Amino acid sequence: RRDWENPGVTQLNRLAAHPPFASWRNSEEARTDRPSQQLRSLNGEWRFAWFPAPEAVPESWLECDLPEADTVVVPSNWQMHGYDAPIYTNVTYPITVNPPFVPTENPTGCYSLTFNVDESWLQEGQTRIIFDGVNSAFHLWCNGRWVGYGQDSRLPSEFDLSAFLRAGENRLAVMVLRWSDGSYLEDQDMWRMSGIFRDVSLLHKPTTQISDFHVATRFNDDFSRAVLEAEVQMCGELRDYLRVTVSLWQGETQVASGTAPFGGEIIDERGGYADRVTLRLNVENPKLWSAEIPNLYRAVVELHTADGTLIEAEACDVGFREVRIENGLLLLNGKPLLIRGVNRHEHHPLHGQVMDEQTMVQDILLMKQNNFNAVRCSHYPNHPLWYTLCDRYGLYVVDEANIETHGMVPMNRLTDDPRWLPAMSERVTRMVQRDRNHPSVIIWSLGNESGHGANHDALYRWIKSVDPSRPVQYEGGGADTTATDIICPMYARVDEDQPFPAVPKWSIKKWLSLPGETRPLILCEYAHAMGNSLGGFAKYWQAFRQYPRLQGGFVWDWVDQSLIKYDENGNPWSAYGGDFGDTPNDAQFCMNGLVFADRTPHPALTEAKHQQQFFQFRLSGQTIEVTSEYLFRHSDNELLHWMVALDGKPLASGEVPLDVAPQGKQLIELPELPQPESAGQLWLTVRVVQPNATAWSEAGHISAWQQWRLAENLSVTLPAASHAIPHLTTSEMDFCIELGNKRWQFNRQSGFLSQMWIGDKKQLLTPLRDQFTRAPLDNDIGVSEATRIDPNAWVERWKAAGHYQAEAALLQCTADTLADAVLITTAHAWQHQGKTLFISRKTYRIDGSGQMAITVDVEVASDTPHPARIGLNCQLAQVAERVNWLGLGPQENYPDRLTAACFDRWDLPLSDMYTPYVFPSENGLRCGTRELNYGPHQWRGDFQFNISRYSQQQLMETSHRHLLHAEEGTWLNIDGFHMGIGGDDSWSPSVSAEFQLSAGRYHYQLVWCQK
Amino acid sequence: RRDWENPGVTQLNRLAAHPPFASWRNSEEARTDRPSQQLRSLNGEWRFAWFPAPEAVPESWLECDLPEADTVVVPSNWQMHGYDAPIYTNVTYPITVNPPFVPTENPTGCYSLTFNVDESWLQEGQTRIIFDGVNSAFHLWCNGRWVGYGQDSRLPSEFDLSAFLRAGENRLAVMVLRWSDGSYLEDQDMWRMSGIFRDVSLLHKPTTQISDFHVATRFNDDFSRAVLEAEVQMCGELRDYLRVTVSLWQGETQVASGTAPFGGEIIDERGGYADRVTLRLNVENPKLWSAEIPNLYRAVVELHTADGTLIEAEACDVGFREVRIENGLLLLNGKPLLIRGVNRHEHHPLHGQVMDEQTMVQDILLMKQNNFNAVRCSHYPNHPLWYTLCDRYGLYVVDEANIETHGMVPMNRLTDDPRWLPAMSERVTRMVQRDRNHPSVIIWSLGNESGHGANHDALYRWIKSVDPSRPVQYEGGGADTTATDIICPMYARVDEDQPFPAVPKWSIKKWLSLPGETRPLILCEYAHAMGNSLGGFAKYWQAFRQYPRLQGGFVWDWVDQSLIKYDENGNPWSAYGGDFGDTPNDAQFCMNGLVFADRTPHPALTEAKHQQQFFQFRLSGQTIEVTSEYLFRHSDNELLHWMVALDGKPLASGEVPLDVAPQGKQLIELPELPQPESAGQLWLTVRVVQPNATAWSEAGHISAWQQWRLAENLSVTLPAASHAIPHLTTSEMDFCIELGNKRWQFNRQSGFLSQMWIGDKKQLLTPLRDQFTRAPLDNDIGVSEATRIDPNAWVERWKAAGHYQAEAALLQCTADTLADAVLITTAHAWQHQGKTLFISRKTYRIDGSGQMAITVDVEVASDTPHPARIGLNCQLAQVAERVNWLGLGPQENYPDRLTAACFDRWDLPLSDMYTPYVFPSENGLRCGTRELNYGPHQWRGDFQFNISRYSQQQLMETSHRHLLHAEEGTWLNIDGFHMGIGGDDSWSPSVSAEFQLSAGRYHYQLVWCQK
Ligand SMILES: [Mg+2]
Ligand SMILES: [Mg+2]
Ligand SMILES: [Mg+2]
Ligand SMILES: [Mg+2]
Ligand SMILES: [Mg+2]
Ligand SMILES: [Mg+2]
Ligand code: NA
Ligand code: NA
Ligand code: NA
Ligand code: NA
Ligand code: NA
Ligand code: NA
Ligand code: NA
C-alpha cells in the first residue's frame, strides 16, 4: 500500500509516546542525570542512497548495502549534502494541492546501518529504536524484515526491535519519503527539506517497566507549601512485591520521598488501574521556578521490589511553578508575567534543520543576554534537548504542535474536516505526552495558521482535560476563537485597527475591551524583523507596560533562514529562496531574524534588548528613580553606572549598587555636578552592569541603560572675524569661489555643487545633489511571495509617482558677493510627466574661514506619496578608515528605531557604518547627528546620515550582499529628514503616520568645512 | 496486513459520511419522497460461505462463486441461519481481553453477489455501493479487484465502484469478519452476532453533486418567526453557472424558496468555501414539530445551472423545533419536556439484529399507544428508517454513538487512551454527519458504559462545535462528568442513595441539588423491566412531576432479546443466554423488556402506560379536575367517560367532552349520583377516550384512566340464622365436620385441612397449608453475570435462613362444638436447624350456613429475612375454565406495582391468570381482592392471589416456560400479604422498605363457601 497517501495511516507498529527515558539501572546515575548504558546513540556515519521515487528502490537494498550508496553523517537533511534542492516556499504548498495524494516523483532517501547489540540485550529485555526526527514519513526494516512505518517530522517514532535482533551484525534499512499526506500538515513558512535530521538511538528496557509518568505541582495560597503528585504507569507482569518510589532531590539532599505498591484508586464501576500508582509528596517552602531564577529539583522514579531490588529508574528535572489565568491575567506563581519573547525556528546555515547543543546554547545565551525571557517553538515540537536547556537556563516556552495548513483554501479546509482529526490529534497528543513534565513549557499551542476548525476545539478540550496545569492557545481563525485561553494575534498593531473581514486584527489595546472579552493578550508574533526593520518596536512596549492585560508577545523572529552556498573560488555566501533552482519560491522572505544565520546580530537586536529592559528609570532633579520589573528576584547582581558629558566630553561619573526588590523602587541622588559655562548640552547616561558572571552572561554585562538631557547652555559667542574674503569667478557654465587653496565649483546648468578642491586634489566624484528616495527596504517592497505586484506598497507608490525617475529642472542659480563671502542661491523642481513632485531652494554661503553654510528649504506636493527621505548625497573622492560623529550610535538607527541608540562621540571603522543585510537596501543611517567627520571633511548641523562604499543605486539593483562591489570613493547621504522603516509586518504599509514625511515644507541647514 | 487487528485502520477507501441521499433527477419526486431510479436496492438472495478464519478462505472465491456456498437472504446475521452460534454475554467480552488482537480462529463470512448494472450508469457520473451494516469488519472486492475495508457495525460504509464495474453482470465479494479491533468498542449487553445485517444499495450520483447538506431552524423569542438555514456542499466541476435552490414545502404549498451561486462568506485569511453555499429562508408562524404534533415541512435541495438545468436533487423532512437547555431545564420550543421514554434495541426473535419496516412500525405504534414519547438508541446508530418513522410518527430520539467498552478494566482504559481516539471519533463524527438533519433526534449521546476518558471530552466538544442545536449527553464515569450537558444516571433511585466509590448513584432528588449542580437530570436507564418487575415505577413519576429539573427517563427496556429455537417436534420456544451452546453466557439477563420478543405485552407495560398519562386528575366532592400535561396541543381528540359502580355493579355513567388547553385545567361537575342503601363501596372510574383514529391509534383508544373510592356503606346486617348445626366426628387421626352435603376433614397429626367434600366429591389434591415463600423473581435472584454468587440477594437470604425447607411443627390442634358451629383451633411453628422462623395460629369456624371462616395470625422472627409472602396455598382438584374476582385487575399486579390495576368485577379464562415469563417465577398475582370465584368455590376477605396449573415448586425448578407442564388440578395461592417485586435494578435488593413484610405480626381472615 501507499501509506504516505492516506491520512488514516500515520504509523504502523509504533510505540506509544512518553517522557524522555534512559532506563537507568542505578538510582544514583539517574539522580545525577549521568549517561545510561541502556541508552545508545546510533548517530554517526550511515550508508545513504538517493532515489527519484520509492518504486525505484531495488529490493536488494533490504538485504544488503548498495555499492552505489555513499557514506554520510546522520542526523542530516539530504539537501545539505547536495542530493537535491531544498525549497523555500512560504504559503503555497511545495506540491500540487490534491490531498491526500503527493507527487509520484517523491524523492526517496535510503539510509542503512550495520550494528550489533550487547549479548544481554539478546538474552532478555525490550530493545527499541528511536528516531527523534524523520522528514516527512518512513518505513523501517531490520535484518531484511519490515518493522513499521511513521509520520510527523517533529516528534519521535519508536519501534520494538526485540524480535528482529540477532547475534553478530544487524542491519537497519530506512526508506524516507520527502512527501507524504503528513506534508499537508507541515506547511510552515520555512525551507522544505527531508531526511533523518534528528538523533537515532537504541533504548533497552525491562519487560516489567516504567512506561510513563507525570509530575504535577500544586500550591497553597502563598506558595509556602506544595504537593508533588506523580502518576506512574507500568507495562509487563504485575506482581505484589512490586513498588514505586518517587524521591525529590535538591542537590545532594533528598527533601521528600514516597513509596507505594501498584494499584490506583477506584475510578469507575470496573475498578481502577492495577498497573498505575500515584505518589504524593509534601514539600515545605519550595524553591520556585521562573525564567528569573530557574530553581530546579530532581525527581527520581524507581520501579523496584518491596525488599530493595531496583528494576529500573527514570527521572526528570522538576520546576515548582504554577501557571494560571485569573481575572484576565496570565499568572506565574501568582504574578502577572510580561512576555519578552521571540519565535525561533531550528535553523542552521550549514546543517539546515539539524540542531546541536552548541547552537542551542548559543541561541539561549544571546536571547537572555538581550533581555528575552520566552521563546515560541514555531511551529512544531523542538529537539528534545531544547526543553532541558530552557528548563535549566530559564526561559518560558510555548510548545507548539506540528500542524500548519496555511496553503489550503480556506485555511481550515483540513482542520475542520473530521477525517483529518486522527492525524491532527496525534501531533497534539504525542507532543503533550512527550513534553508535559518540562517546567519551562508554560503554554500549549495547537499549531499555526490552519484557520479555525472543529478539530481545533476537540483538541483544545483534550489538552484541558489531560493537562489543566498549562493554558492552551491558538491564533488561527481570528486569534480569539473558542480554542484559545489567550488572545494571541500575529502582527496586530498597537493603535491601528486592520478590520480584515472575518479575521480582523484589532489594535491590541482595543481588542482587550471588546464587548465580553476578558482574556489576556499576548501576540504569538509581532515586530516582523525582516531586514532593516523593527520600527515602532518601542510603541509595543509602552503599551505592554501600561496595560495589565497586554502581556507582551514573541518577536518574529530569531534567526535568518539563509543557507550557505559557495562560488567558483569556494567563497561562501548567504543564499535564500530560489538560489537552489527551487521554484516557485518566495525569495528573501525566509530571512526575518534579529540575528544573521551565523548568529551575528542585526542592528534591531539592540532595540529589542533596550525596550525589553527589566529596570525602568525616571529622572527628577538630582534624583534617578529605578523601578524593577522583576517579579521574583532581587537585584543581587547589579550596580548602576552613571556618567555626565558635555557634547560627548566626559565631565563626571560614578557608580551605585542596586538594592531593588521585584516591583520595588530605589531613589538615587546624584552629587553636585561641576557647572560648565562652556556652550553645549549636558547628557546623563546610566547603565545597569552585572559585576558577576552567570550561566548566561559574562562579568561586566550591561543589561540596561537610559539617557536624559540635563542642563543646556546655548552659545551666544560669534566666530572669529574673517581675515580674508573669498573671490568669485563667473562663467556662463560655472560659478567658482576661491579662498586660500580651496575652490568651490557650481555648475550653472545643473545648479549643483559639482566640484571642490583642497589644493589640486578633487573632493567630489559625483556632484552634491538633493535626494528624495532610498534603496527600498524589505518593508518598502512588501511581499511574502516572489510573485506579487502590489500598488499599495511604498516602493510601488514611489515608482508610480516617478520619484526614482524625477529629473531636476533648474529654476534659479544666482551668485552675490557679500562683505565677507559669496552667496550662491539655487532653486530646482523635480518633475515627472509635467508634475512637480518637489521643489528645492538653497543658498550656499562661503565666508573667509572656508566654511560652506548650506540652507535648504524643500516643498513636497501634498498629493504625491510621502518621500523616503529629504536630504543630499554625493560621492566623495576620499576614502578614509574612520568615521567619527557626535550623535546617536554607535549602531545603525532610524527615526522609528533609535531609542536604543545613545547620543555621544562615536568613532568606528568605515565598514561598520555599513549593515550587511543579505538583501541589500538603505542601511547604516544614524540620526540626531550634530557633527560628522570623515577624512578632511566635517559637516555640522542636526541631520541623519549614512556613509559607505555602495551607492543607493547599487544597493537598489543588487539582490545579494555578496554581489556588491565597493565603488570608487565614498558615498555620503546627509538627510535633514528620513522616513520611518516600519516593521509591524512586511507585506503592507507599516510606517506610522508620525514617521511619514508629510509636513509639506521642510527646512534644514548644514555647514561643510575642512579639518 | 491484519487490518481487523489495528485500531489505527478503521477503513480503506471509504467515502465521506453524509445524510440520506437518493439523487433524484426530478424535483417533484424528491418533494414527494417517491422512489428514485438512481437508488437501487441490492437486497435479496446472495451466496454465502462460512469459514473458521480468514486464512481458510480460498483465493478462487474472489474470481468466482464457491460450489459449497449456499443461497441466503441478505441482510441477515449468519447466526440466524445456523452457520455458527450467537453469544449472549453482558459485560465480559466475548473474546480474550488483549487489544487490539482478536482470536486467530475468527469466524469469517464470505458473501457474494452477481448483479447487473446498466451501462447508462457507467456512461456518466459516479456509481457507489452502500452497506448500511456489516458486523463487525469487512473487505470488499468487485470483479476480483480489491475495493476497500470498513469497521463500525452500526453505520453505513460507502465505496466508489465506478472504475470496478462493467456493463451487464458484475460480482461482489465481501469477506466479513466476526471479530476485529472494532469489537473492543462494541461490548453492548446483547447478542453477539455478525454478517451483512442491514440494507445494501447502489446509488448513482452525477460527477458534479451535492456531497452534503445541513438544515437548521432558528426562532425568535416566541416562535412566531423562524429562519431556515441550509448549508450545501458540492463535489466535482465547480463553475460560475452552478446554483443551489432550496425550497420549503408544506404539503403541496411552497412556503419559501431561496436560490444562490456557490461561494460561502469569507471565513479566514485564505478566503472561504467556494464549494459551499448557505441559503436562508424566512418562515412566518411556522408549524412547530414535537412528539405531540409531528408537523413536518419538506425541504428540497436542487443543484442546478443558473439557466434551469437540474443536475440532481436531494431532500429531507424538516421539523421546526428548538432544543435548548436553559436555567437547568431541557426545553422544546420553549417548554420544559417530561421525557416518557424507553431504551430500545434492534432485536427480532427470528431475524436477530436485522430490522424491517413492519417491526419498526409495530414498536412505534405500541410505544405511543402506551404513552411513551421518546426512545434511546441503545447503544448505537439505528437502521436509517427508524429516524424517518420517529420524525413522522413523533418520538423524541437520543442518537447514540456505537461505543461501549464495558468489559475493560477499568471501564475507561480505552476511552482515556489517545491511541483509541481515532477509532472513537469516527463512531461519533460519522453518526452526526448522517443523522443531524432528522428533527426527531434531540440529543446526541457519546456512547454507553465506557467509563469517562479524555477522548469523551474531545468528542463532546466536537459535537458542541459542529452542531450547537442539540444537547450532548453521556452517562459514563458518574453520570455527571464534564462530557455531558445532562445528568443522566442509569438506575439511580428516587430516594435512596447508593454511595458507590468514585461513581455513586445518588437519589435523583438529591443529585439535582448537590453543591454547584445546575443541570437537568434525565435517567438514561431506569426501572429495569426484567421478568416480574417495574415495582416502584410510580415512585419515579411522582418525583418527575414534583421536581422541575427531574425531566423523566428511559425505561430499560423495550423488548426481551429472546431468540426462537425449535424442539424435536418442530415447535418453537424462546431461548436465552447459553441456549445455543454459547459459553460463557449471562443466561436470561438479555430479557429485560416491557414486551416479549414477539411484541406481546408484559404486565409491566400497562403500569408504564398508566404512570405516563398526559392527563392528571383530582377529585373534590362532585367535581373532577382534569389537568393536561401536553405542552403544545389542545385535547382536540379526547372525551371523558366516567362510571360509578357498587362493588362491580354499575350504577351510573356518562361522557363529557374534554376541552383542555396544554398545561391547562378543566373542571367537570358530576351529576347527582345515586345513593344505594345496599352495602358496599362506590367506585368512580374515569377514562380518557380518543373518539377519532390517528396514525398511531384506533378510534376508541383509551389513553388514560383513574379511580377513586366514593361513599362506602359498611354492611351491618346479620346473616340469617342457621337452621342446622355441623356435626363433629373425632378419631385419633382426624376431626371431621359435616353439614348437609358438605364435609371437612382436619388431620390431627399435621394440623391442616386435608380434605373437603361438596356433595360427595373431593376438592383437594394437597392440604391447605401456610406458605411464606415464592418462586424467586428475577429481582429476588439478581446476578447480571451467572458467574457471581451473592449472599445479599433476597433468594439467597431466604435459602440461608431455611425458608424454603423449614417444616411445620404442630403445637396444637383442637376441636370444640359451639352452639351453632364447630371450631377448629391450630398452631404451627416452622423451624430450621433449631430456629423458629414463623408461628401460625388459626381458627376454622364452620356454622350452619355451610361457610368456613379462617382466621390467621402469624409471627415472624425479627431476625429472619422478611418473608416473600404470608398466606395459604393448596391444590384444588377442580380445573375450571373461568376465574371471577372482585378486586384489582384485570392484569397481573403486585403491591409495589398495582396503580394501573382497577378495582371492579373481573372474569377471565384460567390461562390469563398465568403470566408466561420466559424465565419462570411467582406470577399472575392480583391484589386488593375481596371476592374470588373458581368453580364451586368462593373466597371472601381482603387478600392477594394467583391461581394456575403450576406449583410454586415447579415454577421454582423450571428454567424455561416451554418446559412447564400443567399439574393435576389448580394451584391456589391466597395471601394476606405479599412482598414487593422491586425493579429499580435486577442485580441488588431493590424492593423498597415500605413493601417489605417486616411488621413482625400479621393478621388476615378468609371465608370459604360454595356459591
Ligand atoms: Mg499516512
Ligand atoms: Mg504560514
Ligand atoms: Mg533511595
Ligand atoms: Mg482496524
Ligand atoms: Mg454494558
Ligand atoms: Mg422550479
Ligand atoms: Na502589561
Ligand atoms: Na518569513
Ligand atoms: Na545590587
Ligand atoms: Na536590492
Ligand atoms: Na419534572
Ligand atoms: Na440486560
Ligand atoms: Na376533545
What is the number of the ligand closest to the CA of B785? 12
Q: How was this structure determined?
A: X-ray
- First-to-last CA distance in chain B? 81
Q: What distance in Å separates the CA atoms of residue A347 and residue B646, rounded to the nearest whole number?
A: 98
- Please answer whether residues A49 and A110 qualify as being in contact, where contact means their C-beta atoms are separated by less than 8 angstroms: yes
Which of B 424-453 lie inside 8 A of A, CB atoms?
425-426, 429-430, 433, 449, 451-452
State the cell numbers at B919: 424465565
At A898, which amino acid appears? L
- CA–CA gap between residue B895 and residue B983 (Å, rounded): 13
Q: How far apart are CA B743 and CA B956, in angstroms?
A: 33
CA separation for the pair A332, A470 (Å, rounded): 11
CA nearest neighbour of B997 among B769, B720, B740, B803: B803
- The residue in chain B having the minimum alpha-carbon distance to the alpha carbon of residue A461 is B458
- What backbone phi and psi angles, to 5 degrees, belong to A781? -80, -45
CA of B328 to the centre of ligand 2 (A): 44
Set of cell numbers at residue B449: 458504559
Assigned C-alpha cell, B130? 452502500
Spatial separation of the C-alpha atoms in residues B491 and B506, rounded to whole Å: 10
Note every long-range contact of A710-715, with CB atoms under 8 Å and residues 24 or more positions apart, other chains counting: A710/A644, A710/A673, A710/A681, A710/A682, A710/A683, A710/A684, A711/A682, A712/A680, A712/A681, A712/A682, A713/A676, A713/A677, A713/A678, A713/A679, A713/A680, A714/A679, A715/A679, A715/A680
What is the B27 CA–ligand 6 centroid distance (Å)? 8
- Whole-angstrom CA distances from B321 to B389, B440, B983 are 17, 9, 35
CA A878 to chain centre: 38
Nearest neighbour of A458 by CB, restricted to B1, B265, B458: B458
CB A740 within 8 A of CB A724: yes
| C-alpha cell recorded at residue B140 | 470488499
CA pseudo-torsion sign A416, A418, A423, A429:
positive
Question: How far is the C-alpha of B199 from the C-alpha of B74, rounded, in Å?
Answer: 8
Give the residue from chain B lying closest to A413, CA to CA. Answer: B273
Task: Retrieve residue A97's grid coordinates.
Answer: 494541492
Cell of A377: 517553538
Q: How many CB atoms lie within 10 A of CB B263?
A: 16
Task: Say if CB B502 and CB A267 are below 8 A apart.
Answer: yes
How many of the other CB atoms lie within 10 Å of CB of A444?
27
> B267 vs A418: CB contact, 8 Å cut-off?
no
Instruction: Please list the residues that pair with A938 across neighbouring strands.
Output: A933, A1009
Q: Helix and strand tally (H, E) in chain B?
A: 13, 58
CA-to-CA distance for A936 and A741, rounded, in angstroms? 14
| Pair type for strands B297-305 and B276-284 | unpaired
A904: exposed, middle or buried (Cβ count in 10 Å: 0-12, 13-18, 19+): buried
DSSP state string for A349-418: TTTBT---HHHHHHHHHHHHHTT--EEE-TTS---HHHHHHHHHHT-EEEEE-S-B-TTSSSTTTTTT-G
Which residues from chain B sit within 8 angstroms of residue A1, using beta carbons? Answer: 1
Cell of A121: 540485550
Spatial distance between the Cα atoms of A915 and A778, rounded to a whole number of angstroms = 14
Calculate Rg over the CA atoms of chain A: 33
- Whether residue B105 contacts residue B53, with contact meaning beta carbons closer than 8 Å, is answered with yes
Does the beta carbon of A460 lie under 8 angstroms from any beta carbon of chain B? yes
**The dihedral sign for the CA sequence A194, A195, A199, A205:** positive
Residue A59's SS3 state is helix
Strand A761-762 versus strand A764-771 pairing type? unpaired
Residue type for B797, please?
R
Please give the Cα distance from B117 to A776 (Å, whole number).
67
**Which distant-in-sequence residues (6+ apart) come within 8 Å of B970 by Cβ?**
B875, B876, B878, B879, B880, B910, B934, B947, B948, B949
- List chain A residues with CB under 8 Å of B419: 16
Taken in order B437, B443, B447, B452, the sign of the CA dihedral is positive
Number of residues written out for chain B: 1011
Mutate to test the interface with A, among B5, B10, B267 (most CBs of A within 10 A): B267
CA A41/CA A83 separation, integer angstroms: 25
Closest ligand (CA of B448): 5
Show the cell assigned to B139: 473487505
Q: Give the up-direction half-sphere exposure of residue A477: CA atoms within 13 A in the CB hemisphere.
A: 21
Q: Which residue has the cell 447466526?
A: B79
Ligand 6 centroid distance, CA of B230 (Å): 17
Q: How many Å apart are CA A285 and CA B675, to the nearest integer?
A: 88
Q: What residue in B sits closest to A432 (Cα-Cα)?
A: B418
Q: How far apart are CA A520 and CA A327, in angstroms?
A: 9
- Identify whether the C-beta of residue A412 lies closer than 8 Å to the C-beta of residue A453: yes
Tell me if B488 sits within 8 A of B478, measured CB to CB. Answer: no
Residues 6+ apart with CB under 8 A from B941: B930, B1004, B1005, B1006, B1007
Rounded to whole angstroms, the Cα distance separating A486 from A374 reads 16
Tell me whether A410 touches chain B (CB under 8 Å).
yes
Nearest residue to B604 (alpha-carbon basis) of B190, B909, B922, B983? B983
Phi-psi region of A936 (alpha: psi -120 to 50; beta: other; left: phi over 0): alpha
Burial of residue B507 (CB within 10 Å: 0-12, 13-18, 19+) is middle
Name the packing angle between helices A537-546 and A604-611 (round to 10°): 10
Catalytic positions of B are 449, 525
Angle B278-B284-B289 from CA coordinates, rounded to 5°? 85
Question: At B283, is the secondary structure helix, strand, or coil?
Answer: strand
Helix, strand or coil, per DSSP, at residue B434: helix
B537-549 per-residue burial string, b: 16 or more CB within 10 A, e: under 16: bbbbbebbeeeeb
- Please count the other Cβ atoms lying within 10 Å of the Cβ belonging to residue A299: 24
End-to-end CA distance of chain A: 81
Q: Assign residue B44 a region: left if phi > 0, alpha if psi is -120 to 50, beta otherwise?
A: left
Q: Which of B412, B419, B478 sits opposite A16 (nearest CB)?
A: B419
Are the C-beta atoms of residues A532 and A778 closer than 8 Å to each other?
yes
Q: How far is residue B746's CA from residue B736's CA, in Å, rounded to a whole number? A: 6
Contact B956, B923 (CB under 8 A): no
Distance between CA atoms of A425 and A458, rounded to whole angstroms?
9
| Cell numbers that stand for A973 in this block | 547621504
Rounded-to-integer distance, Cα B673 and Cα B678, Å: 15
Ligand nearest to C-alpha A248: 3
**Residue B10 sits at the chain A interface (C-beta within 8 Å):** yes
- Closest residue by Cα to residue B932 from B887, B965, B977, B976: B887
Q: How much distance in Å is there from the Cα of A340 to the middle of ligand 7?
A: 11
**Which active-site residues of A does the annotation give?**
449, 525
| Long-range CB contacts for residues A844-847, cutoff 8 Å, separation at least 24 | A844/A744, A844/A746, A844/A753, A845/A818, A845/A821, A846/A726, A846/A737, A846/A739, A846/A744, A846/A821, A846/A822, A847/A722, A847/A726, A847/A820, A847/A821
Q: Kindly list the residues from chain B whose CB atom is less than 8 angstroms away from the CB atom of residue A987.
A: none
For residue B357, give the H/E element and its range.
helix B357-369
Cα-based distances in Å from A277 to A207, A264, A432, A961, B819: 18, 5, 20, 61, 84
Please state, as a whole number, how many other Cβ atoms lie within 10 Å of the Cβ of residue A772.
24
Residue whose cell numbers read 456509481: B127
Cell matching residue B905: 368485577
For residue A1005, the surrounding DSSP H or E stretch is strand A1001-1010
All three cell numbers of A936, joined, read 578632511
Closest Cβ–Cβ partner in B10, B425, B477 for A418: B425
Strands (E), A833-892: 835-847, 852-860, 869-876, 882-889
Would you give the distance in Å from CA A293 to the centre of its chain?
23
Helices (runs of H) and strands (runs of E) counted in chain A: 12, 56
**All three cell numbers of B7:** 485500531
The answer to whether the beta carbons of residues B181 and B135 sit under 8 Å apart is no
A269·B411 Cβ contact <8 A:
yes
Three-class secondary structure of residue B443 per DSSP: strand
Cβ within 8 Å of residue A104, ≥6 positions away: A53
Interface membership of A6 toward B (CB under 8 Å): yes
Nearest to B707 by CA among B642, B612, B753: B642
A283: which strand partners? A226
Q: Where are the beta strands (DSSP E) in A519-586?
A: 521-526, 550-555, 563-566, 572-575
Residue type (1 letter), A937: H
Packing angle, helices A357-369 and A384-393, rounded to 10: 40
A 248-287 residues inside an 8 A Cβ radius of B:
265-274
The neighbouring-strand residues paired with B140 are B148, B174
Find the closest chain B residue to A92 by CA distance.
B270
Angstrom distance (rounded) from CA A446 to CA A435 = 14
Nearest CB among B8, B272, B430 relative to A9 is that of B8
Peptide bond into A895 cis (omega under 30): no
Please tell me the distance from the alpha carbon of residue A825 to that of residue A811, in angstroms, as a whole number. Answer: 10
- Whole-angstrom distance, CA of residue B435 vs CA of residue B417: 27
How far away, in angstroms, is A665 Cα from ligand 9 center? 13
Of A268, A409, A503, the CB nearest to B412: A268
**Helix or strand (DSSP H, E) at A172:** strand A170-177
- Using CB atoms, which residue from A273, A410, A433 is nearest to B410? A273
CA distance B550 to B540: 9
**Residue B501: count of CB within 10 angstroms of its CB:** 12
- Å between A10 CA and nearest CA of chain B: 8
Give the whole-angstrom CA distance, residue A262 versus residue A238: 8
Phi-psi region of B691 (alpha: psi -120 to 50; beta: other; left: phi over 0): alpha
Q: Are strands A329-332 and A339-343 parallel, antiparallel or unpaired?
A: unpaired
**Residues B818/B802, Cβ–Cβ less than 8 Å:** no
For chain A, say whether B492 makes contact (Cβ under 8 Å).
no
Residue A952: all three cell numbers together:
543607493
Q: Which three cell numbers stand for residue B56?
A: 481458510
Give the gap in angstroms from C-alpha A632 to the nearest C-alpha of chain B. Answer: 35
Residue from B971, B973, B969 nearest B761 by CA: B969
* Ligand nearest to the CA of residue A420, numbered in listed order: 1
The span from the CA of A310 to the CA of A244, in Å, is: 10
Cell numbers that stand for A421 in this block: 482529526
Among residues B632, B576, B56, which one has the least CA distance to residue B332? B632
DSSP secondary structure of A300-353:
EEEEEETTS-EEEEEEEEE-B--EEEETTEEEETTEE--EEEEE----BTTTBT
Which helix (H) or strand (E) segment holds residue A934: the answer is strand A926-934
Supply angle C-alpha B121, B122, B124, rounded to 5: 80
Is A462 touching B (CB cutoff 8 A)? yes
Report d(CA B763, CA B878) in Å as an integer: 7
- B479 CB neighbours in chain A (<8 A) are none
Short-list A750, A748, A752, CA closest to A735: A748
Ordered structural domains, chain B, with CATH = 1-206 (2.60.120.260), 207-321 (2.60.40.10), 322-612 (3.20.20.80), 613-718 (2.60.40.10), 719-1011 (2.70.98.10)
Burial class (CB in 10 A: 0-12, 13-18, 19+), B582: buried
Q: How many CB pairs under 8 A join A and B?
A: 148
The three-class DSSP label of residue B71 is strand
Comparing CA positions, the residue from A792, A783, A788 lying closest to residue A919 is: A783
Phi-psi region of B723 (alpha: psi -120 to 50; beta: other; left: phi over 0): alpha
The candidate with the shortest Cα–Cα distance to B558, out of B369, B856, B769, B346, is: B346
Residue B568: exposure state from Cβ atoms within 10 A (0-12, 13-18, ≥19): exposed
Q: How many residues does chain A have?
A: 1011
Show Cβ contacts of residue A342 under 8 Å, excluding neighbours closer than 6 positions. Answer: A367, A372, A374, A375, A376, A554, A555, A556, A557, A558, A594, A608
> 3-class SS at B287?
coil
Instruction: Check CB contact of A503 with chain B, cutoff 8 Å.
Output: yes
Q: Is A882 helix (H, G, I), strand (E, B) or coil?
A: strand
Cα separation of B459 and A474, whole Å? 19
